[PDB]
Amino acid sequence: SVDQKAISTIRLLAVDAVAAANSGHPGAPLGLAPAAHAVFKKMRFNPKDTKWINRDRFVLSNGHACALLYSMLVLYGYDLTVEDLKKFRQLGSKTPGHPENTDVPGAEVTTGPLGQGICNGVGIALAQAQFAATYNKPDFPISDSYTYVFLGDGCLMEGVSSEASSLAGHLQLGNLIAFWDDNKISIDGSTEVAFTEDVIARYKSYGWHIVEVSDADTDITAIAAAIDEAKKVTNKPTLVRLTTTIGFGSLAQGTHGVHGAPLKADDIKQLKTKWGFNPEESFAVPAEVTASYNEHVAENQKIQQQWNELFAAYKQKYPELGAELQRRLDGKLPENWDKALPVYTPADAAVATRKLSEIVLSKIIPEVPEIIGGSADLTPSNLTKAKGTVDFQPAATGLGDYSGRYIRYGVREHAMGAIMNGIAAFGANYKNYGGTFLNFVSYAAGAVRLSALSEFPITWVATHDSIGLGEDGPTHQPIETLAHFRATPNISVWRPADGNETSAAYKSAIESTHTPHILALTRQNLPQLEGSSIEKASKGGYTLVQQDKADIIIVATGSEVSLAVDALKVLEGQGIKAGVVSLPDQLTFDKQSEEYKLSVLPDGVPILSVEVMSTFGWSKYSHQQFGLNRFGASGKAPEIFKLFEFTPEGVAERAAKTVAFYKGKDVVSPLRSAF
Amino acid sequence: SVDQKAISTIRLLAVDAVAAANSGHPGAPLGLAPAAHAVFKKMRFNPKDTKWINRDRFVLSNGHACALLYSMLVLYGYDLTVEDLKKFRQLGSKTPGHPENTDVPGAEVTTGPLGQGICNGVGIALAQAQFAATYNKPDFPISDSYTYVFLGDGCLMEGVSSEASSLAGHLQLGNLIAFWDDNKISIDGSTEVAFTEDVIARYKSYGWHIVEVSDADTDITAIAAAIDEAKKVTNKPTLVRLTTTIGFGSLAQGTHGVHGAPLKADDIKQLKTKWGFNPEESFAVPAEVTASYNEHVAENQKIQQQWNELFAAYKQKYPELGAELQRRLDGKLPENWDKALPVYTPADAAVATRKLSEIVLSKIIPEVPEIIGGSADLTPSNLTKAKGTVDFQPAATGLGDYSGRYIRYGVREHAMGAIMNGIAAFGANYKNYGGTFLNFVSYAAGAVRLSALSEFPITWVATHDSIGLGEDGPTHQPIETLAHFRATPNISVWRPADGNETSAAYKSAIESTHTPHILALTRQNLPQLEGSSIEKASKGGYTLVQQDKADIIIVATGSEVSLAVDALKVLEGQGIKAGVVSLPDQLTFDKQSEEYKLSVLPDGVPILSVEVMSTFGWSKYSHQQFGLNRFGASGKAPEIFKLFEFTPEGVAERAAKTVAFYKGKDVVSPLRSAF
Numbered sequence A, B: 001s002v003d004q005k006a007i008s009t010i011r012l013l014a015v016d017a018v019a020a021a022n023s024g025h026p027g028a029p030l031g032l033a034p035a036a037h038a039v040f041k042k043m044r045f046n047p048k049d050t051k052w053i054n055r056d057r058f059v060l061s062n063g064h065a066c067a068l069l070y071s072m073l074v075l076y077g078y079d080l081t082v083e084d085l086k087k088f089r090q091l092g093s094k095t096p097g098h099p100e101n102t103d104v105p106g107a108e109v110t111t112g113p114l115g116q117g118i119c120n121g122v123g124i125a126l127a128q129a130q131f132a133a134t135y136n137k138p139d140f141p142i143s144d145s146y147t148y149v150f151l152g153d154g155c156l157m158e159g160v161s162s163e164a165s166s167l168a169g170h171l172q173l174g175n176l177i178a179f180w181d182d183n184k185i186s187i188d189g190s191t192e193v194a195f196t197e198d199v200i201a202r203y204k205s206y207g208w209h210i211v212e213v214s215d216a217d218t219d220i221t222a223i224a225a226a227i228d229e230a231k232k233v234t235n236k237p238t239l240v241r242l243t244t245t246i247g248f249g250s251l252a253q254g255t256h257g258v259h260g261a262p263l264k265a266d267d268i269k270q271l272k273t274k275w276g277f278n279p280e281e282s283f284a285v286p287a288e289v290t291a292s293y294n295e296h297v298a299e300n301q302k303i304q305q306q307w308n309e310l311f312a313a314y315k316q317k318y319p320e321l322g323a324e325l326q327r328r329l330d331g332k333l334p335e336n337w338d339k340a341l342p343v344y345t346p347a348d349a350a351v352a353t354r355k356l357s358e359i360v361l362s363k364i365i366p367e368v369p370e371i372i373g374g375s376a377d378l379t380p381s382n383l384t385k386a387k388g389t390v391d392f393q394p395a396a397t398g399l400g401d402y403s404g405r406y407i408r409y410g411v412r413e414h415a416m417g418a419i420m421n422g423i424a425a426f427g428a429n430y431k432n433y434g435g436t437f438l439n440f441v442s443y444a445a446g447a448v449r450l451s452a453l454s455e456f457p458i459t460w461v462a463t464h465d466s467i468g469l470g471e472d473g474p475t476h477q478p479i480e481t482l483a484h485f486r487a488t489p490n491i492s493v494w495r496p497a498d499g500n501e502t503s504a505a506y507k508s509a510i511e512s513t514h515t516p517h518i519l520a521l522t523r524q525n526l527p528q529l530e531g532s533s534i535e536k537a538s539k540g541g542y543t544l545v546q547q548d549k550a551d552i553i554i555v556a557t558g559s560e561v562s563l564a565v566d567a568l569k570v571l572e573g574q575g576i577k578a579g580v581v582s583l584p585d586q587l588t589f590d591k592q593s594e595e596y597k598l599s600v601l602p603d604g605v606p607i608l609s610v611e612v613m614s615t616f617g618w619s620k621y622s623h624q625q626f627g628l629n630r631f632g633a634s635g636k637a638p639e640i641f642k643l644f645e646f647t648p649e650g651v652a653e654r655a656a657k658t659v660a661f662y663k664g665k666d667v668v669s670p671l672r673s674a675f
């Protein structure tokens, strides 16, 4: 039949791509081609409009199986061709060895690191439920799409997927349909060596629905029926167990050797002949497969055309909601939304930046409907919920509604991070955030790095940034954390010192379209600074205190800016004139013009950095660095600062030593380099 | 009864400690005091010998509940007193806000970051099973101890605990007995808001045994019976569901407000009067409680005295095993074990450092019985198994034996990291390791940081260190990873360039007693270097190529040392004389004498670093840095190096620019500083 021919075509495109690269993973593509064919035939999508907001989404969580995804996208006429398949895994191609959303048309998210994609699918489904609850009206199903995820044994072993699956079951996300490639083989061999749990019983315990397909090597009728069954279960996510043979058809089917290396040439020949293809030909695309797939595309395009007319009718019936939806689909924030950001003066009281963050959220959430977010069981400590908002929960629980704006992630930082990526991936201008303590953002590093690589504008509300948290002690106090994330490409790491800087950090985070943000916020109170403003802090680094005859400039962030200002006064008593630079975001600063940056960090003056954590990175901006390169301590925070000499006198002493060290030396800006 | 009085004493010590600090967590201590009393009465331990190798171990995974642990340790006469309890959460005390094994006698591991302790308990239990299988003989139960773990809802939400619980069930670890504080309250309120899964059904799916105690606020008889029941189930770890009231006894019992803040003074008064204590007194220790607990200590000490005689008899009957066991309990490696380390010369073939690592392991595993380790489903890629060894598996599976030495962790990096910490915590000189790709060590950051804080000599065999891995692409290629871990206190991060340096890295990792190691290893082949040796690489940094009239020194690591040597030759053709420094471990180098370090990085010469990852940290050792501060690419590795100009010509160009930039400048070593 044409369906059988399509499945063989998919299998052989994937195998031929791996062969051409002499690199990659043929096993799971061979095993999952029937399911991929069946799922894509049920999906609504437009190859010519990858951003249609009511499309069904597909996520390949087992991203090593990407030759399968690329084959589907090519066959359906996305902006990806057989010539791109021939360049699989080659430098600069549109067919990299794991899918990247920035590079591959039709790749919703970036996968490859196991466990991430299923969690991203939870986030796409969470966003779809929130979006539908916000906009749908009687006779106006603006959003009614599904989220389909493929995943393997490795994804099921990774703890992040357990976190997200527990939460998705709690959230009753009935438009999520996941498919487990139950092939009993991972890199180390049989799953009997390490993975003998009853997966299905575990997913039932989370509140998922289960469908089992025992013959998924051939039974596409049962796979399609499993989708139909899943769609009838509107209050549970569904896991479809696909019992497959890894490498189905290969001489080496059912072995670990077919997971991750190219097939032998004679194996590929026998695959082709058994399936009616020419063993002398590679990258064959039978025209009857193209015709069948084109029929489905044409039907999907008529569905999108009708959706566009539904949307036009919605704008007439619901003028305000319709204009809001249009603005969001255009990628634009509300006009002048930033007028809601709080502004402070030096006459205002000292406030912790966690509390300043709460106040910002309180003001901007009512103004910007596409902001949603939550906390990983730290709501009363991170201060991430705006009073008067409703939680995102299924209404059946009585605890919230899908129209809610605040997510109770539970103690699940890693899944929160990956779910945030999925909410961003949904689109519709979602600007979403997640709270935890800065030190426990590290639990989510796998997902955070993917926010950066995927260019998603997610925001971590990362409170309790330092030893300033006090008594909880060194297991809670960051040292390395900012260096880690600042060293990752494409992460804006804001460490605001006061009210105006906190508003600038949020302006950046919400306006972002391609850069994730981490906002490092304090437990302890900090004064409002003389010289701060949203305008200057928006530059990432700025001259807080200008001193034309400076003997030294002190550059600092966060809680240490006030310390630097106090040190300036001690230094004046010693006959040393200092300037102060505040550097709330190194990435934003780096992106400013060379001339602006040199106006902040000029030649001809020693520069000392002060920040109560690792000194790594700081030589970009300073000649000498005063930091904390050891673990913290459990005690009252002011006593810890005193212990480590993060006091006005301790900073002044080091500043004076810095001036002395450069006596009779020619000093150029740290911004200069040889290349 | 005296048991009731003991439980009240524990509760009130914990409450009084929190009150004195005006900080900390009274709720779970109040709820878990009955269980703690019951468990400690069943445990075998010596307060005067915290390292008895056949002790039962206790782990408080819900580490915020530490006032409970400290109260137990004080009551049992560990080296911790009521005066230390009065200093709870105060700077420098022996009673920090979360337990630290380095500081607190009787704290086996460091907890506070949720999820870790249960995984550490899995590792203690894994080690005990391996140890018992190695040493026990008929009539000689050298090791027969249990591992008891307390854990809360937050631990059960964290994905790391799911990973370890799946693995522990697979491994049939029947001497592990965990207790869930089922109090239905976390920081965000009722667990109904985020955590509605059927925990018990999930643990059954992992292959655990379950005991439920519905009245754990009072029913110590049932808690003791649950322990007895668990001990009869020798082939499954057990989860005991303790249904408790958080804050039991408080006016505010059963609320989130009692989780994490001190009780009101009037609440503490009514607690004391209802339990027969004086509301005017704090830190009361009734002498009848001390007497009862002392009776149990005395019995335990007689058990240890008999164990010492068993051990002496074992040494007579089994002289070789007995001497091996004695050496391990003394903390000493085999005499001259390091003679087994492979040595290379520049005439030997090029080898990837992952393969050099395999060869080291092959030679040292047969010589050093306390080495065990595994991989997170990457055995054939990390090359972490010595041929001819048997896997650690329950014999009932037919797949290994508990005497085995190689652990199949599955796709579980974070749990692997925390399990490694537990194996180290067991003691007996275990030197244990875990393989994954360097980029996915980041999945385990929560545990890695605790290896550093806890001072455990664990080792990550972290292959595929860079863009040199090639086609798998940027989701697999580290950029930030070494900077992250080098910025963490107390992590040795070895990036060996060749065979001799790889042997030095293992010498350091195996000899370690207080510092975790990460060995960053290549996929791609590297040449044997002229000038390398185990002796010089053991210094962490050394002069590979000395040039008395150097115009520049190039400092490099790993794969970039050979690149630097090739660049030296290009530079010679340009009339520039370079030296080369190899810096295989920055931490080890930093610990050398100032004079040694200055002999490697002298004054008076520009220094350029070369390493194909983040430049963060490198200004400690260089004036200019050539690194990679962007994500990688999917393609053949040599093509990626060429793209980013990590070629002999690209390094030479930057070296020449560096020489030019310092023309007419006075240059001092990067090792100098102002303070």
Ligand SMILES: C=C1[C@H](CCOP(=O)(O)OP(=O)(O)O)S[C@H]([C@](O)(CO)[C@@H](O)[C@H](O)[C@H](O)COP(=O)(O)O)N1Cc1cnc(C)nc1N
Pocket (backbone or CB within 6 Å): A027, A028, A062, A063, A064, A112, A113, A114, A115, A152, A153, A154, A155, A181, A183, A185, A186, A187, A246, A259, A260, B376, B377, B378, B380, B381, B382, B411, B440, B443, B472, B523
């Ligand atoms: C454990 C698995 C994986 C095991 C997955 O087992 P599975 O999910 O059951 O998939 P199959 O049914 O296809 O067997 S896949 C993976 C790769 O990195 C690919 O993403 C791996 O295959 C490498 O490409 C390969 O080892 C390179 O070989 P070499 O020639 O360089 O030696 N991988 C590593 C991995 C480990 N941990 C995370 C978080 N993500 C990952 N991708």
Ligand SMILES: C=C1[C@H](CCOP(=O)(O)OP(=O)(O)O)S[C@H]([C@](O)(CO)[C@@H](O)[C@H](O)[C@H](O)COP(=O)(O)O)N1Cc1cnc(C)nc1N
Pocket (backbone or CB within 6 Å): A376, A377, A378, A380, A381, A382, A411, A440, A443, A472, A523, B027, B028, B062, B063, B064, B112, B113, B114, B115, B152, B153, B154, B155, B181, B183, B185, B186, B187, B246, B259, B260
């Ligand atoms: C979510 C929980 C935790 C929630 C645990 O719920 P649970 O396990 O059910 O414990 P209970 O039964 O006692 O309620 S505990 C924790 C703390 O950091 C303590 O370790 C937290 O209590 C802080 O001390 C507190 O928020 C500070 O308050 P503030 O005055 O500064 O505002 N915590 C944070 C946490 C989050 N993630 C990880 C990995 N580890 C953690 N310890």
Ligand SMILES: [Ca+2]
Pocket (backbone or CB within 6 Å): A152, A153, A154, A181, A183, A184, A185, A186
């Ligand atoms: Ca598999």
Ligand SMILES: [Ca+2]
Pocket (backbone or CB within 6 Å): B152, B153, B154, B181, B183, B184, B185, B186
């Ligand atoms: Ca709880």
